[PDB]
Design goal:
The complex is a heterodimer of chains A (28) and B (249).
Chain A: H1 19-25
Chain B: E1 5-6, E2 15-20, E3 25-32, E4 37-40, E5 46-47, E6 52-53, E7 59-63, E8 77-86, E9 101-105, H1 123-129, E10 135-140, E11 154-159, H2 163-168, E12 178-181, E13 201-205, E14 212-220, E15 231-235, H3 240-248
The complex binds ligand 0G6 and 2-acetamido-2-deoxy-beta-D-glucopyranose.
The ligand *C[C@@](*)(O)[C@H](CCCNC(N)=[NH2+])NC(=O)[C@@H]1CCCN1C(=O)[C@H](N)Cc1ccccc1 binds at residues 28, 43-44, 47, 95-96, 172, 192-198, 218, 220-222, 224, 231 of chain B.
Chain lengths: 28, 249
């Protein structure tokens, strides 16, 4: 279904203030 | 949440508050996984030493909230519970093994910009994301310090810790149904969940499909945010079969 896609962020193509920290942890 | 920061509005739309009806009391955190099912920690519902052994009628949940204490007109929703399901092998006498419970809402809740479910992990997603050093996010309205309480929902990102490290950090017996997370003694960064955050979600954002998945449930710890120690979380994927069975049932 539609789980895990936030109306105010992913659905509007907006990044929240700290999610980049999670993405970057997949490298280091 | 200790050493975290304020959540942005709509940042964790699956966040749920668990309340005791009378006297009204914010008890724990929980998460929305569908329009009618909520996931939480079993010790929030059953822990005899703390005089906790609730039935559906004793509780209520509030969804869509941001402020811990202020009413949020046309945003927050209250729901009654139809049934509570605690894992049959939850071990509260020893180490909180299988600290997990499901709650079925009396009626489906309507989704909105502030209310939306989180995903449960599949095998592939768990294999890729639940690895040491990878960071997940924990949220809650629990204590700001070891002991006070936040005015709004708090959030903190924490790295998953290697099993042996988790094991050597505590005398309490850990099992495969748990994982631990937290920064190390050397790291400048800090942060931890704390009392009151139990039942809240440990989520991770998939870099493959951009969806948020719930990998853990805030379960236990010793103190909060102490260097050398780590917070423990119920391993959701590990108990996924039980979860599926309850929902299918
Ligand atoms: C119920 C939750 O609010 C709370 C979360 C603690 C998370 N702490 C950190 N640092 N991330 N859980 C508890 O308080 C659990 C419930 C039972 C007692 N408990 C503990 O964490 C004890 N401090 C340790 C413990 C006792 C018995 C079995 C396992 C752990
Ligand atoms: C909770 O209380 C119920 C109702 O009194 C009782 O049947 C049950 O044994 C209690 N739960 C536990 C395991 O303490």
């Amino acid at each position: 279904a539609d789980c895990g896609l936030r109306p105010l962020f992913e659905k509007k193509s907006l990044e929240d203030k700290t999610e980049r920290e999670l993405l970057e942890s997949y490298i280091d | 949440i200790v050493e975290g920061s304020d959540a942005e509005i709509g940042m964790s739309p699956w966040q749920v508050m668990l309340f005791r009806k009378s006297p009204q009391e914010l008890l724990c955190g929980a998460s929305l996984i569908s329009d009618r099912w909520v996931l939480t920690a079993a010790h929030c519902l059953l822990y005899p030493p703390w005089d906790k052994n609730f039935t559906e009628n004793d509780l209520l949940v509030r969804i869509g909230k941001h402020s811990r204490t202020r009413y949020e007109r046309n945003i927050e929703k209250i729901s009654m519970l139809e049934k509570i399901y605690i894992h049959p092998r939850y071990n509260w006498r020893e180490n909180l093994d299988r600290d997990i419970a499901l709650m079925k809402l009396k009626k489906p809740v309507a989704f909105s910009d502030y209310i939306h479910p989180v995903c449960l992990p599949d095998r592939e997603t768990a294999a890729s994301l639940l690895q040491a050093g990878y960071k997940g996010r924990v949220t809650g309205w629990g204590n700001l310090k070891e002991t006070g309480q936040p005015s709004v929902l708090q959030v903190v990102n924490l790295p998953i810790v290697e099993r042996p490290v988790c094991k050597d950090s505590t005398r309490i017996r850990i099992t495969d149904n748990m994982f631990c997370a937290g920064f190390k003694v050397n790291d400048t960064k800090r942060g931890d969940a704390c009392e009151g955050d139990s039942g809240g979600p440990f989520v991770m954002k998939s870099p493959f499909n951009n969806r948020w998945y719930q990998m853990g449930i805030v379960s236990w710890g010793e103190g909060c945010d102490r260097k050398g120690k780590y917070g423990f979380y119920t391993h959701v994927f590990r108990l996924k079969k039980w979860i599926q069975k309850v929902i299918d049932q």
